Amino acid sequence: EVARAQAALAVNISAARGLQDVLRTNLGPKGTMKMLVSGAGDIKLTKDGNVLLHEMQIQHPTASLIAKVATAQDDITGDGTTSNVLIIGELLKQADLYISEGLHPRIITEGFEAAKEKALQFLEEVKVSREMDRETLIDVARTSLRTKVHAELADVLTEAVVDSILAIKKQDEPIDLFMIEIMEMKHKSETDTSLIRGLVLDHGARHPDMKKRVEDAYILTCNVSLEYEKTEVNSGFFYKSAEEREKLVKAERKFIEDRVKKIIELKRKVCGDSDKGFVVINQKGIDPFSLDALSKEGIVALRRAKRRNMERLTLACGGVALNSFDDLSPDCLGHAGLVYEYTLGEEKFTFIEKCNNPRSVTLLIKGPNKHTLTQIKDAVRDGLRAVKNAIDDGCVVPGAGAVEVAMAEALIKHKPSVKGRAQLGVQAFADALLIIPKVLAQNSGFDLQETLVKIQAEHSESGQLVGVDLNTGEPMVAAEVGVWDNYCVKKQLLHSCTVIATNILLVDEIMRAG
Amino acid sequence: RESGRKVQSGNINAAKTIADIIRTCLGPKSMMKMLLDPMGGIVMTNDGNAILREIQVQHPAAKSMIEISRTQDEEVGDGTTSVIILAGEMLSVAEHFLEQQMHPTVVISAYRKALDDMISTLKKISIPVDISDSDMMLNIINSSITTKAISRWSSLACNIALDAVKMVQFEENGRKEIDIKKYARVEKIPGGIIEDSCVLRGVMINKDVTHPRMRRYIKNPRIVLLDSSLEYKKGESQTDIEITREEDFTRILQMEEEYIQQLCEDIIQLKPDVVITEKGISDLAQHYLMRANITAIRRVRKTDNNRIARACGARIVSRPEELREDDVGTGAGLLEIKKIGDEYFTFITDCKDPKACTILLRGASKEILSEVERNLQDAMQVCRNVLLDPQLVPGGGASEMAVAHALTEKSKAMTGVEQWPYRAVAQALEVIPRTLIQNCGASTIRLLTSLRAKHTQENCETWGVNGETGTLVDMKELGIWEPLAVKLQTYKTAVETAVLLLRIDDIVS
Amino acid sequence: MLKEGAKHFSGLEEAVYRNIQACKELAQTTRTAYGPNGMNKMVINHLEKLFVTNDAATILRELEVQHPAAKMIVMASHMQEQEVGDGTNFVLVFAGALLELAEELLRIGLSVSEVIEGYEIACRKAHEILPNLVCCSAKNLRDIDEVSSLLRTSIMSKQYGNEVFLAKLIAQACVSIFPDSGHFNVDNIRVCKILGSGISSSSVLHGMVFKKETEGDVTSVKDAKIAVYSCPFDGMITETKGTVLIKTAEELMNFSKGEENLMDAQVKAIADTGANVVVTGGKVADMALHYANKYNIMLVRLNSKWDLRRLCKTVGATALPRLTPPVLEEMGHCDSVYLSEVGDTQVVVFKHEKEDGAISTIVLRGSTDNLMDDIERAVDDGVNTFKVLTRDKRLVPGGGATEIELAKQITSYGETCPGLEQYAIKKFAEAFEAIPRALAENSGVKANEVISKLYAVHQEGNKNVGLDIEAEVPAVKDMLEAGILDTYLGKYWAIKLATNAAVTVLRVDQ
Amino acid sequence: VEKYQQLQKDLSKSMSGRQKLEAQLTENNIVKEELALLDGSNVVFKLLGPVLVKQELGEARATVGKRLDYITAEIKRYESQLRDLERQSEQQRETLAQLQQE
């Protein structure tokens, strides 16, 4: 069968509320985390709109539809995902209210478009430039993490947040594709996020007394085997006949023993001095007497690293992907102003740091070693994704729904279309705006309206952006509050808001097909 | 087995319920359709065709609609979404009256008595467009390519379709086949950008060219099509026993060689350098072409050679034993194998045959290439439509309410039984107003009146409603245009189907 | 939810009600499980193997729940029993009654973030007076009576009766030799029980007890280097296949003949490797024995991993199956390697002892291991509370007697601070009486009887109860002045960890 | 594994001269010819044993008819051991393949 006429709509918009509902506080300092033992069945913990989407198994088609378009804006924002979900249903109801009143959804969709642009047009009006400084970096990083985690954990991380982004402005890079190298430490304590302007490896391998403190860092990061498979292989796995698998292994340890001697002069060519520290990093294992005799050379050596690490160390340390243990150039082999193999818990974590490139930069979170440790991780990365937008645009604006009322004050009063047919969609459009501040505040405190009129009146007074104080549920000017949206996010949202809320408003049917 | 008034009503239901949802998806203003699957597959489309695929049909009328849907899709690929909206109406209108007024037959003949009055009205409302003015084509094209809502780099490359298709317009059959699209053979270029995407003459040969097989750049020397019939003859015209032992290797493979060397000469005699030989090549046929240092390009496909037979526009050799430069390598010709982005691209150009031109498609990626080509595909189809009939017609209900009157005027005139089928068929024309009044979201019944009021004097000549403007409008003031080609086609198409399903009362296992 | 999609475990009832269910539902048995108790709670495995624990974990880790919060909060109880010791039952039992308060604040309709902070500032307000409620500390590990008291409340709040005798035993376990200066061996001293004798005969041995049977002539020296091997003699039966199975059927037979020469050369190599004790997780056999009698090495006939791993750990050894003559990467860490008969049973006794790095292996004895296993549970309470790593542990009165100290104040401080906040602060300090009530109702008397007296006695640190007759009527036992105290640390984590999850779990609508 | 190759020699064993037959089989048609082609013009001999046996047409006529039939007969003896050896080595293939992989 099929669902046509209104039925192609209701089920979609009816699904778009409880969806919108549960995460109504996933957001802002009022935001509340959710778990899943349900969707993927595991023990899971998450706060974000798009992120809690995918984790569930969502059999309602619309629930999967926003996840796509939200992910687009989710990428750069990392917050407002949960937000954009909320205004769309807030929009869908009014349009539904029109079709409930009765009306044509496409002329209603037609009613969004001027209003959207008018709001977009208003969005550059309301975008106020706070250029990039740690304050704007703080207040956006926290308001993102105040959204994503505790304002406590926000300001706990807001240091670590601005930590890496200082060197990405050294990169002059409006985005962070590195310094986003994050290490998650085994500890009891969540809150500890350690800035390392180099990388961290969990390695330093299997051997101590390698001079795990390396002041002159010369890094060979290699995939060469100082250790390797003992497993039976002929074609690469167990062969039908047994014996031909055997002839391979007797060249392994000999190859490894030889490369030890190759590192000797590779220590002597490069350094000749144990006082000049040399670092090997193997992507594979390393036999003990390798590291042991490599410890004899004044070399620390790290078996079994990762591709990012190799490259990040190739980057941060000015290091290498170089493949050999034979005598190589020290200038090739990268450098860090300091290197140490650090131990918290069981594993010895090499802190490599003051690296030639302060490019891939460790923010090292300690933690309970849980989904909680997984939880505290994902947010700060998005806390950046907030402030990168702040780094992106010059315009950083008061958050907590400060922009929303002024638009409804801007838009509706004079008809932005000067035309009711669109004003229909406009009146629908400018109601979507208000939910997030008024739903969070009323969740966090005093209501939508009696709070609205306070945010309204002060907007109606000033037109200045008075946001919400979510510490109460009452309005304040979100400039001073520090909760600060950028122009980017709010720019991006109407795009992700409208275009998805339109084409689905114009579904003329839905059918199980094949 | 399914039979009878059921299938009769079933001829209604299927084509009806098909056409029903789809008019909302018609028009530049269009109301999209959602799909879901028990598989979970979700589809948001204004595209009937794409819909017409993933949907299921448990009735062969619903199945044969897909057939006649692909008919217009075989033809163009647009208006298919439109054609279904016509007959689905018709059977849903005339039949239940007129089949309970008892006949398959009356409206059948009246379907023709419908088909002509359109053509009649078409000779008025459709007014000629010239291919000399690009915009005069391109405004239809700009309207046709914005149908799929990419005006960006499609439009400027639609000039290339406005050129390539128009410049592969050729082959008068004496009733003049020339109006056409297909002879335009798209180029695929990694790298470049639709900006620098521009026609070269004949057919630009991408397909078999990942690398030069034909020199590098050839200007005068003739690009030459050798077509089968290059296999040896060990006898005069015959073939005797082949190589077996010592001197047969000599004698026989020599017997093979002379006949081909004899075939070879006639190629070299017309001065080639590159020679493209499709299948049916001898290594004997190449090596004397190698003895003349004239590259013989072997075992390459037919359309590609027909592209090349359209690229220098030479023919394909029908008597490879007696060869002419008039046969292959005509004119001066050109052959140019160019790396643009990744791939070497053979350009066989300076075409004889009336020009010929193919769309150079250069995207940065193949995506930014493809987005253009898909809307380009509208132009090159509308180009051939402008080539077919170069009479631009006012869009919207301009043709609809026009023919409706003229049909009901033909009802007033003929005053027979088929007057009622007219008033049944003339009722089908109002779809576009209803479709557009839907897609604008206005009130039809006033605009129905107002368009009859537009016909009451203007005859709805250029005046339909355009839901995209939302109002009843001259389509000259909106510049909305289509060739009489595309109109009658789509018009006639479902009329045939309106006959078709109405013919069918019976299914038997 | 409302839709085809959204697989969700929480929200509405689930969030409001059903979370609080498994909150109070699991908080049920911990009401009986912390504070002086004998409470018999009979837990059998998927083996359906009879046991009774007075510590929540063996109940908790036993259980299975689809509630992640209830499945989470145990990790705080873990984090308790990880960082700390008895008081692990306290973790769960506290929050559950505290959590109901929030849902009744939701019966009031109070906002989450508003109830969230009320527990928290009050917690740091509880953590404010918590050091103010430090009464004594644990003066000397060297003082048995300091450690007995340390072990007393430990064992008590699991098992009240066996308390002091064990508390005198494992205090005289002289784990004091570990200064608690930042070194104490928890596992290297671990109990090895003796099935048989008495649980009063249960004592402490110093040096590693291994109840497993000595084989071979006992170690040629003491400090004997220790060959710890998974199967050095399993027999000469093949160790050699990737799946440890047959390749062709003729291999198992050759292991009978050259067994001698192997079990000669092998334990000869054990005599050659310097190990005068080779530890065989595989079977002892006569030829090994006979040759280990010629070579006078003590075979350790069969091994648990707990044997092996500890020997892999404490000796620095690596347990490996052997057929060929083996070698020592292992050697000893142990400076005295004994066969002693303790519990009257032959007991392999390894010994090396240091202020840091000693092995003092408590030898429990008793008629039933289902005794000592829960005894060890009750015993490990103090083994934990040994490790605080402040020797002077800033003891606050144990047994929840110093609760009402906080309870009165924070809730009086409750109205001090205002608003929807103040209730959660007031609610925060109302969850104290739970454990005493829970305990006093293990002795069968309500809180209000008891607690209004704890309200009447006001500022003591002294009064609390829950297994006794003084538990019943008077609401006066000294869970301070009678020798029951508890370190700031545990009592910190008692409040701290019971603070954490209760708030954090409140967020989830899924 | 030897199990793959084990019975294939015993197989091709019975196949070996069976193939040789099938040329003789073809030439048994030819000796039927060359017996029918010999009316006695030049002597006809079954060569059997290191002794040359003086022979006749009718002595070799049934014979070459018997030979051709018999030269079809060593076909079936292999056809016996054909599906003996190829089939059991078909089971053996998986037997010690995984065990040696194991």
UniProtKB/Swiss-Prot annotation, chain A:
Mg(2+) binds at D79. It is an enzyme of class 3 (hydrolase). PROSITE patterns: TCP1_1, TCP1_2, TCP1_3. The modification N6-acetyllysine is found at K188, K276, K354, K366, K377. One of its GO terms (biological process) is protein folding. It is found in: Cytoplasm. Keywords: Acetylation, ATP-binding, Chaperone, Cytoplasm, Hydrolase, Isopeptide bond, Nucleotide-binding, Phosphoprotein, Ubl conjugation. Belongs to the TCP-1 chaperonin family. Component of the chaperonin-containing T-complex (TRiC), a hexadecamer composed of two identical back-to-back stacked rings enclosing a protein folding chamber. Each ring is made up of eight different subunits: TCP1/CCT1, CCT2, CCT3, CCT4, CCT5, CCT6A/CCT6, CCT7, CCT8. Interacts with PACRG. This is T-complex protein 1 subunit zeta. It comes from Homo sapiens (Human).
Swiss-Prot record, chain B:
Keywords: Acetylation, ATP-binding, Chaperone, Cytoplasm, Disease variant, Disulfide bond, Hydrolase, Intellectual disability, Isopeptide bond, Nucleotide-binding, Phosphoprotein, Ubl conjugation. The modification N6-acetyllysine is found at K207. It comes from the Eukaryota. It catalyses: ATP + H2O = ADP + phosphate + H(+). Disulfide bonds join C351-C357. One of its GO terms (molecular function) is unfolded protein binding. Pfam families: Cpn60_TCP1 (PF00118). The keyword Ubl conjugation applies. The keyword Ubl conjugation applies. Its main location: cytoplasm. Belongs to the TCP-1 chaperonin family. Component of the chaperonin-containing T-complex (TRiC), a hexadecamer composed of two identical back-to-back stacked rings enclosing a protein folding chamber. Each ring is made up of eight different subunits: TCP1/CCT1, CCT2, CCT3, CCT4, CCT5, CCT6A/CCT6, CCT7, CCT8. Interacts with PACRG. Interacts with DNAAF4. Interacts with DLEC1. This is T-complex protein 1 subunit gamma. The gene is CCT3.
UniProtKB/Swiss-Prot annotation, chain C:
It is found in: Cytoplasm; Cytoplasm, Cytoskeleton, Microtubule organizing center, Centrosome; Cytoplasm, Cytoskeleton, Cilium basal body. There is a cross-link at K211, K241, K247 (Glycyl lysine isopeptide (Lys-Gly) (interchain with G-Cter in SUMO2)). Mg(2+) binds at D86. ADP binds at Y34, G35, G87, T88, N89, F90, M156, S157, K158, G399, D486. The keyword Cytoplasm applies. The modification Phosphoserine is found at S10, S149, S200, S256, S304. The modification N6-acetyllysine is found at K305, K387, K453. GO terms for cellular component: azurophil granule lumen; cell body; centrosome; chaperonin-containing T-complex; cilium; cytoplasm; cytosol; extracellular exosome. One of its GO terms (molecular function) is protein folding chaperone. Its EC number is 3.6.1.-. Signal peptide: none annotated. Keywords: Acetylation, ATP-binding, Cell projection, Chaperone, Cilium, Cytoplasm, Cytoskeleton, Hydrolase, Isopeptide bond, Nucleotide-binding, Phosphoprotein, Ubl conjugation. The modification Phosphotyrosine is found at Y17, Y492. ATP binds at G87, T88, N89, S157, K158, G399, D486, K491. Disulfide bonds: none annotated. One of its GO terms (biological process) is positive regulation of telomerase RNA localization to Cajal body. There is a cross-link at K446 (Glycyl lysine isopeptide (Lys-Gly) (interchain with G-Cter in SUMO1)). CDD domains: TCP1_theta. It catalyses: ATP + H2O = ADP + phosphate + H(+). It is linked to De novo genetic variants in nearly every subunit of the TRiC complex, including CCT8, have been found in individuals with a broad spectrum of brain malformations, and clinical phenotypes ranging from mild to severe epilepsy, developmental delay, intellectual disability, ataxia, and other features of cerebral malfunction. Belongs to the TCP-1 chaperonin family. This is T-complex protein 1 subunit theta. The gene is CCT8.
Swiss-Prot record, chain D:
GO terms for molecular function: amyloid-beta binding; protein-folding chaperone binding; unfolded protein binding. It comes from the Eukaryota. One of its GO terms (biological process) is protein stabilization. Keywords: Acetylation, Chaperone, Isopeptide bond, Ubl conjugation. There is a cross-link at K54 (Glycyl lysine isopeptide (Lys-Gly) (interchain with G-Cter in SUMO1)). There is a cross-link at K54 (Glycyl lysine isopeptide (Lys-Gly) (interchain with G-Cter in SUMO2)). The keyword Acetylation applies. Signal peptide: none annotated. The modification N6-acetyllysine is found at K9, K54. GO terms for cellular component: cytoplasm; prefoldin complex; protein folding chaperone complex; RPAP3/R2TP/prefoldin-like complex. Heterohexamer of two PFD-alpha type and four PFD-beta type subunits. Component of the PAQosome complex which is responsible for the biogenesis of several protein complexes and which consists of R2TP complex members RUVBL1, RUVBL2, RPAP3 and PIH1D1, URI complex members PFDN2, PFDN6, PDRG1, UXT and URI1 as well as ASDURF, POLR2E and DNAAF10/WDR92. Binds specifically to cytosolic chaperonin (c-CPN) and transfers target proteins to it. Binds to nascent polypeptide chain and promotes folding in an environment in which there are many competing pathways for nonnative proteins. Belongs to the prefoldin subunit beta family. This is Prefoldin subunit 6. The chain holds residues 13 to 114 of 129 of the full protein.
